[PDB]
């Protein structure tokens, strides 16, 4: 068992908004939960885009999840990751 390296990135900056992508990589086994949350509440499926849970080529796997937010609301959003018992919550950089 290998825990993922979670990493949040900010992209597509315009009109006071940004796209925030939560990457989870280098993990095993394949099964994982990854979702953006606003105030600890999981976002709708139709407000997020998911990367497929696919192999690295080193025996481990990677996935991602992204959503659009407003600048000034970063503290309000978190990426929740759960994987083989353990779980964690990751902030948006500002």
């Amino acid at each position, epitope marked *: 068992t290998v825990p993922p390296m979670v990493n949040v990135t900010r992209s597509e900056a315009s009109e006071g908004n940004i796209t925030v*992508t939560c990457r989870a990589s280098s993990f095993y086994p394949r099964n994982i939960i990854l979702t953006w949350r606003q105030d600890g509440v999981s976002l709708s499926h139709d407000t997020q*885009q998911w*990367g*497929d849970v*696919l*192999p690295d080529g*080193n025996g481990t796997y990677q996935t*991602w999840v992204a959503t659009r937010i407003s600048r000034g609301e970063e503290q309000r959003f978190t990426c929740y990751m759960e994987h083989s018992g353990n779980h964690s919550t990751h902030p948006v950089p500002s």
Partner: antibody
Amino acid sequence: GQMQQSGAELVKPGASVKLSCKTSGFTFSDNYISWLKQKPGQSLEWIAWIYAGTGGSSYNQKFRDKAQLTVDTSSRTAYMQLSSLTTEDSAIYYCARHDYYGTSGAWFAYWGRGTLVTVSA
Amino acid sequence: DVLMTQTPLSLPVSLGDQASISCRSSQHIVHSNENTYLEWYLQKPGQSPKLLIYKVSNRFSGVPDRFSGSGSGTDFTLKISRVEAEDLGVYYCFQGSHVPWTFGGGTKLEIKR
């Protein structure tokens, strides 16, 4: 972006050749680079992919001893080394990328123009 | 291996007519992550293959809505609702679900004029 493949190669039987796929206009490290084989007037085969971010790879077992994929992050360029060439290795060889973040689960979303390899004495 | 059989091998169709191509796999192609990586490509003459459809039914960016993909189990179909002249070329189905990944034999679309 762009995916510039090297010009056609003539190579002797038993020799090897290193094909290149020089790229630009996109985040190279966030892409699976696959290599595919097409003999003119026939269908295609998948050889292997390499994820540029990790250098990790998956190989079609048919091309296990044939092909060796590598990636140079600095130059944003992918390489396939083919070795012990026979006449049956004469084909068009394509590099294609899986835009993992832009269109996830689409394996050959953008292609190079192809390098024609002719194996002959 | 997953064998991929297409029908027909050649497909004459009149301009503005509906064309459809079948792709039959020898076994199921649901990846263990529960996606079905069936993809359709069009190779125009003198060009490399171009992506039309991924994961069974998802139209790739730039691809006109006249192109449509569907199916499940071992039975998959690409449909073109109003065939324009630029649609001619060879169509390939592909599975990226089970290693080794495998292409269909190809379906040659010709404009019947």
